Amino acid sequence: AGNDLLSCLTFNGVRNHTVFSADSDSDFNRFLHLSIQNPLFQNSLISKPSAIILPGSKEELSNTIRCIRKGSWTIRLRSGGASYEGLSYTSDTPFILIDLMNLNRVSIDLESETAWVESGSTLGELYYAITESSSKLGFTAGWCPTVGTGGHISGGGFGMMSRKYGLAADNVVDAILIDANGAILDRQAMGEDVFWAIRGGGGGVWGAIYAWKIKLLPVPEKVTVFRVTKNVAIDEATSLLHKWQFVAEELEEDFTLSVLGGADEKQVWLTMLGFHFGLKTVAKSTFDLLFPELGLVEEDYLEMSWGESFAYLAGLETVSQLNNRFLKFDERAFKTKVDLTKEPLPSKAFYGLLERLSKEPNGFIALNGFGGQMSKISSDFTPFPHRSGTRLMVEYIVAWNQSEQKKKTEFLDWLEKVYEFMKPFVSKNPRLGYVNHIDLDLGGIDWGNKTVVNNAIEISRSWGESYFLSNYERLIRAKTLIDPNNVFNHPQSIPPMA
Ligand SMILES: *c1c(C)c(C)cc2c1nc1c(=O)[nH]c(=O)nc-1n2C[C@H](O)[C@H](O)[C@H](O)COP(=O)(O)OP(=O)(O)OC[C@H]1O[C@@H](n2cnc3c(N)ncnc32)[C@H](O)[C@@H]1O
Ligand SMILES: *[C@@H]1O[C@H](CO)[C@@H](O[C@@H]2O[C@H](CO)[C@@H](O[C@@H]3O[C@H](CO)[C@@H](O)[C@H](O)[C@@H]3O)[C@H](O)[C@H]2NC(C)=O)[C@H](O)[C@H]1NC(C)=O
Ligand SMILES: *[C@@H]1O[C@H](CO)[C@@H](O)[C@H](O)[C@H]1NC(C)=O
Ligand SMILES: [Mg+2]
Structure with missing residues (x-):
């Protein structure tokens, strides 16, 4: 039983545990919600742990697992609780949540x-x-x-x-x-x-x-960074993103340029995030040469x-x-999807993506180039296989707050349609x-x-x-x-x- 579990934990010196409680503000519910980073999985309909155990050492972690197995519980491990799908704190079968926050x-x-x-x-x-x-x-x-x-x-x-x-x-x-x-x-x-x-x-x-x-x-x-938001129309935003993909994957390994993007009707916003392993003179000379269209100025470049x-x-x-x-940070529920690419994205892919973003201000995209050391590590050095030949990672996100819950189905449909739109341009088979x-x-x-x-x-x-x-x-x-x-x-x- 749960009491058997408790007995086993005590016998093994594991003292930090809390059984399920219906008391909305019980200590149990407090520990449960402490590390749920996606409000999407936070309502009262979602599965809840039968108990929460907080091991404080490797032996306590070892003994917790040992004790849980003597029952028929499903083990769930949680560190940061950032799982996009809440997989560290949900289960369709009765489960024990092993929360690692004390480690x-x-x-x-x-x-x-x-x-x-x-x-x-x-x-x-x-x-x-x-x-x-x-x-x-x-x-x-x-x-x-x-x-x-x-x-x-x-x-x-x-x-x-x-x-x-x-x-x-x-x-x-x-x-x-x-x-x-x-x-x-x-x-x-x-x-x-x-x-x-x-x-x-x-x-x-x-x-x-x-x-x-x-x-x-x-x-x-000291390294050099910039975080510059361009507020442009779709013609310019499209040409910026289309050129960005080449600048990004091609940059020397000491440079990174990534993008966050969104829109609202005719207004498009692109946030350029730059990083250089070095000083600002070299950083600016490189972007002046490779990406003059960004219109970066001296004061955009920060050394820290x-x-x-x-x-x-x-x-x-x-x-x-x-x-x-x-x-x-923010208290928004979200869903995300991701693509990796092997061939350059055509301009019309960015245009269509921006058009869809323009119709849904709660949506946004994150764009990262690979290349550099990512192309020098073998596909089987570690399990992550997307190395040489991989050009970009593209993330599509939709996020909303409590007052917008009515539109949940609408948001998810938007994201589904964006993913379907991108199908022909990204990795396949x-x-x-x-x-x-x-x-x-x-x-x-x-x-x-x-x-x-x-x-x-x-x-x-x-x-x-x-x-x-x-x-x-x-x-x-x-x-x-x-x-x-x-x-x-x-x-x-x-x-x-x-
Ligand atoms: C930014 C933000 C805000 C989120 C929510 C995710 C992010 C992110 N930025 C990322 C980035 O810049 N680069 C990335 O590569 N990934 C980014 N992500 C995704 C993020 O990396 C993943 O969500 C990550 O898995 C989260 O880790 P976590 O905070 O520890 O999440 P969980 O506790 O929910 O666990 C996820 C998964 O792993 C198992 N788990 C946890 N702890 C374990 C230990 N110690 N041993 C074995 N397995 C463990 C969980 O059970 C669950 O299955
Ligand atoms: C099991 O683990 C939890 C999480 O670590 C423990 O709760 C934590 O307890 C410590 C004290 O032992 C708290 O530290 C102090 O809290 C007080 C009051 O807020 C504050 O004045 C101190 O400056 C310090 O922060 C800590 O807040 C607390 N953490 C949480 C998230 O509740 C708990 O003690 C452990 N349970 C057992 C039975 O040992
Ligand atoms: C098992 O899974 C299959 C496919 O998901 C499903 O059709 C079937 O109903 C399941 N069987 C039982 C007995 O749950
Ligand atoms: Mg109460």
Whole structure:
């Protein structure tokens, strides 16, 4: 029973747990909602955990998993709670939520220039700790400070420094994984196939990552960034985006130029985000040469520390704000979809995308170029396969607040239609995806369904090959090795072999 679970936890010295309560403002509901970053999955109709456990050490994490298995609960692991589909805190079967928020220690070793990072730590907490320790070290990961390292690194982790240094997972050199039996496994213990699989094979599949050991990377004491919003009409916005794609993928590895875009009837807005590993004179000379159409001026270019640049690019007020995991931002529900491209987008693709954005001010797009180091890493170095030959990543987002809930169906329909419009221009056979941008539209396994489970491998190939391409086969072997009994599962987890 739940009381048996409780007894087991006590016997093993795990004290931080809270059982389900109907009391709307119970401590249970407080802990549950503390790390739900998408209000979309926050209402009273959604599944709720039977209990929430907050392990405070690797042994407590090991024993929690050990105890949960003596019952029939589904395990859910949550770090940052940023899952696009709420997969860290929802389940169609009774589940126990293992919340890792107390595992938030970052330990920087300046003598080896590496760090051990407990998996409950956020990217912001990590960046803050790095900046505090050194003005010449940084790390490559995503641009959202509130995202958890647990899910993020497990899925790869792309950001503004990836053209220089690759994904967060491409820079992991050891890890502690707690397996289905509660074993505490470092890189040597888990073996090279499993150490490969965890570095981008997706969270919630292999076991519970207790901590990541990462290599810290050189950054100059001052870098140059810009964040400039152009307010233009569609003719100019189209020509800017069409040229942007070439400038972006082609830039030397020491430069990144990304875009956020949206519109409202005749007014289009494009926010250009620039990063250069170096000083402003070189930064401006490069963009003056390659992209004069942007109309950037001297005062747009800002020199600041690496830590400052990551806080700045995230729209935070100060570096100090990096260190606040529960610092919200906005309170909007959202849905997103993503594409990867292999061929240049024709001008008419950007034109049509902007036309659709112009009709839906709640929608917007995020555009990133690959190339640089992303084209120099082999497709099977880690599970993330989209390397050489991949040109852009394109994200489509629609977001709304409480007062707009009536339009929910309308927003989702808009996003569906945008995705359908882009189909001919983006990757095909299969239409590629990214596991950190998990998308349930592709389908999902009901692990309680016998006929589906028998055919799990074929069925799962739909999303599996989209996220991992030819790396799918090795992932299945790693899964069978580390979690043959499928203790760690969700609608799109890698299936073990029968
Ligand atoms: C910005 C924002 C605001 C969001 C919401 C997502 C972002 C983002 N910016 C990104 C970026 O710049 N670059 C990216 O590559 N991705 C970006 N994303 C997506 C984000 O990376 C993913 O949502 C990421 O998976 C979130 O990680 P998280 O905050 O830890 O999310 P969850 O706790 O919901 O977990 C996700 C998934 O992993 C399993 N999990 C969590 N912790 C685990 C440990 N320690 N071990 C094994 N598995 C773990 C969860 O169970 C769930 O399945
Ligand atoms: C289980 O874990 C939760 C989350 O860490 C624990 O709640 C936390 O408890 C600490 C104190 O032990 C709180 O620290 C202090 O809170 C007070 C009041 O807000 C403040 O004055 C101090 O400066 C400091 O912030 C912390 O707020 C709190 N975190 C949350 C989110 O509630 C809890 O104590 C643990 N439960 C057990 C049984 O140990
Ligand atoms: C199992 O899944 C299939 C396909 O999703 C569905 O048609 C069927 O009804 C399910 N079987 C049971 C008994 O739930
Ligand atoms: Mg009450």
